[PDB]
Amino acid sequence: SPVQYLRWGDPAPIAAVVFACLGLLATLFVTVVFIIYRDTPVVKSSSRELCYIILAGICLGYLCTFCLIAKPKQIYCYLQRIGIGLSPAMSYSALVTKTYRAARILAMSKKNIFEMLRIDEGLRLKIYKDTEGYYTIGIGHLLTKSPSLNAAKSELDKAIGRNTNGVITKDEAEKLFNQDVDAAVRGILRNAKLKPVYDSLDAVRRAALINMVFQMGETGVAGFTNSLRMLQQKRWDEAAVNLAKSRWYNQTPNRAKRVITTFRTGTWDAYKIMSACAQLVIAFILICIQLGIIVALFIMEPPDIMHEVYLICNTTNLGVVAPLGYNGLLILACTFYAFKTRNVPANFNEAKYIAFTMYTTCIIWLAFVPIYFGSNYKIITMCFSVSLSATVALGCMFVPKVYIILAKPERNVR
Ligand SMILES: COc1cc(/N=N/c2ccccn2)ccc1NC(=O)c1ccccc1Cl
Ligand SMILES: CCCCCCCC/C=C\CCCCCCCC(=O)O
Ligand SMILES: CCCCCCCC/C=C\CCCCCCCC(=O)O
Ligand SMILES: CCCCCCCC/C=C\CCCCCCCC(=O)O
Ligand SMILES: CCCCCCCC/C=C\CCCCCCCC(=O)O
Ligand SMILES: CCCCCCCC/C=C\CCCCCCCC(=O)O
């Protein structure tokens, strides 16, 4: 009984139970909120089905306390090794499926910009020089400012990952082009005249503004003071009429006509250019792998009470480390794709919170490796570790969304 330990001078069991109960309450509250407001754009724009999996893992993580702090029965040794190993696998397999799709969506997003500027600006598959005289390759990608051709080939090989001999491919020029876009977007957000327009435009019209920046530079695009303000006010037809009188349109009319048309329609018509049930199946597969790991250790090392509110079992290091390693790979893969997509603004900046969640999860799980093994109170540390990790996933990811649902119903709009 945790209450009796509290009376005897040990508040740790009663604390871990309160942590778990409050956590189940919150997880129940967040779940019902998402069910009720499932049709709203803050819940329907994401994977509602994967969130239920993520919430189940959080809930199940809080339930582990009731198998770590329980009465001595053999099934609770089975439920310990299930919950502690599977509850993270449930939350992070669905999360890695979610983040990986955002990375594929982000990569396919950058391909359109590349096909756009490939047609407008051009592309060389072997090393050349710009009008300054510095070595270049692809769509105007700078390699080195050194007069040595071998230096250009050296920095090119490091940039691609193979011995290119000064010759690349279309996909390897797309890779280098993605660096030049991020650079140009950084200058835009550092430019006070261009920043408010870029924030207002959709993804297609941001490509057209990046196109212009790639042609005239930041200071040059800043000259279109009136036309920029019309685009910010979403006055497309007027912005094209004004841009069609520019000196930019009369010097390069073929290119400018395509960029201007894209500003009007917000489509790619002027140029030549991941399922949902699959996410459930993939998330289900990644969870069965962890279940297989657990079941195999049930056979190699059957659960058994070692021998008291602390239920101590016979779980050996391999029974702890093997699911811990797989869970760590899920966390690392999550952190990788979440970091890669950390600036994706879709879904009310859903990706900004997911990235911050995985940063904390890494520090928590890495910190509790020396903490746990160097501890003589492993059951208590295991209780708080799971609950803490579960609270971070529930706090950083779902609380910002339940907030907008209940506190800001006016911002809940597509
Ligand atoms: C923070 O540590 C854990 C958290 C766990 N669930 N978190 C959850 C559960 C659900 C949702 C989100 N998050 C499970 C095992 C954990 N730890 C271990 O199994 C472990 C054992 C030995 C050494 C180190 C470690 Cl890190
Ligand atoms: C906003 C809602 C409040 C959220 C926190 C709620 C706090 C309630 C905490 C649990 C009660 C105190 C801890 C239980 C120990 C009781 C001791 C005993 O009964 O012998
Ligand atoms: C009652 C046992 C402990 C559970 C208490 C917490 C309740 C919430 C549990 C997990 C939520 C996961 C998803 C639940 C079903 C989603 C419904 C749906 O698919 O629309
Ligand atoms: C308001 C949030 C919840 C308030 C605290 C609820 C917890 C009450 C404390 C007593 C334990 C209740 C059941 C836990 C059983 C522990 C298993 C065991 O006794 O070995
Ligand atoms: C998305 C999956 C959600 C599952 C939540 C509940 C987890 C239950 C999973 C199966 C437990 C079966 C464990 C094996 C039982 C003993 C068999 C044996 O090893 O001899
Ligand atoms: C950033 C996420 C962290 C990834 C999971 C955390 C660590 C997973 C890696 C393997 C841990 C090494 C286990 C070594 C066990 C030591 C045996 C002992 O001390 O008794």
Author numbering: 568 to 678, 1002 to 1161, 679 to 680, 688 to 721, 728 to 834
Anything the authors wrote about it?
Metabotropic glutamate receptors (mGlus), which belong to class C GPCRs, are mainly expressed in the brain and are involved in synaptic plasticity and neuronal excitability (Niswender & Conn, 2010). Among them, alloswitch‐1 acts as an mGlu5‐specific NAM that can be photoswitched through the introduction of an azobenzene moiety, which isomerizes upon light illumination (Pittolo et al., 2014).
In its ground state, alloswitch‐1 adopts a trans‐form, which is shown to fit into the narrow binding pocket of the protein through a co‐crystal structure of mGlu5 and alloswitch‐1 (Nasrallah et al., 2021). We next performed freeze‐trapping experiments at the X10SA (PXII) beamline at the Swiss Light Source. Here, frozen crystals were mounted on a goniometer, where a laser was pre‐aligned at the center of the cryoloop. Measurement of a crystal without laser exposure provided a reference dataset at 2.3 Å resolution. We used the reference dark dataset for the calculation of q‐weighted F o(light) − F o(dark) difference maps and the extrapolation of structure factors for the active state using Xtrapol8 (De Zitter et al., 2022).
